[PDB]
Amino acid sequence: VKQDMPPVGGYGPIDYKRNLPRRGLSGYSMFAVGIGALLFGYWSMMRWNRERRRLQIEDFEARIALMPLL
Amino acid sequence: TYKYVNLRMKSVTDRAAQTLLWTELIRGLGMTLSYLFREPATINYPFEKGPLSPRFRGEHALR
Structure with missing residues (x-):
């Protein structure tokens, strides 16, 4: 006879339990x-703001030199 | 026979870092982006048809 039957060795194991990976860095690492990103941004902003102040002083002194003719 | 669902400084710091930096939200977003890059299961109807069986119950006919 022929009928719907599982095979001679049966079917294989089937996973049925929860599997969460558990991944990412430790919290100290992201902190x-x-x-470090905060410190790097602070240093770069410090340098560029000082340079911008120097350029503004230069432009203002050019304006002061130009004033009497105007 | 039965089981208890929901009966459970480093750990506190890890929880605070997950709060501030959104670790599990990034995990869920990563799974969303994983489902973005797969092959969608949309069959091109009407040029493609869904699978059926020889026992399918459709239109009445007289043989």
Whole structure:
């Protein structure tokens, strides 16, 4: 006879339990990365703001030199 | 026979870092982006038809 039957060795194991990976860095790592990015941005903004102040002083002194003719 | 669902400084710092930096939200977004890059299961109707069976119950006919 022929009928719907599982095979001679049966069917294989089937996973039925939860599997969460558990991934990412430790919280100290992202805190250190954020703090380092903050410090780098602070340093770059400091340098560029000082340069901008120097350029503004230069432009203002050019204006002061140009004033009497106007 | 039965099981208890929902009966469960480093750990506190990890929880605070997950709060501030959104670790599990990034995980869920990563799974969303994983489902973005797969092949969609939309069959091109009417040029394609869904699978059926020889026992399908459709239109009445007299043989």
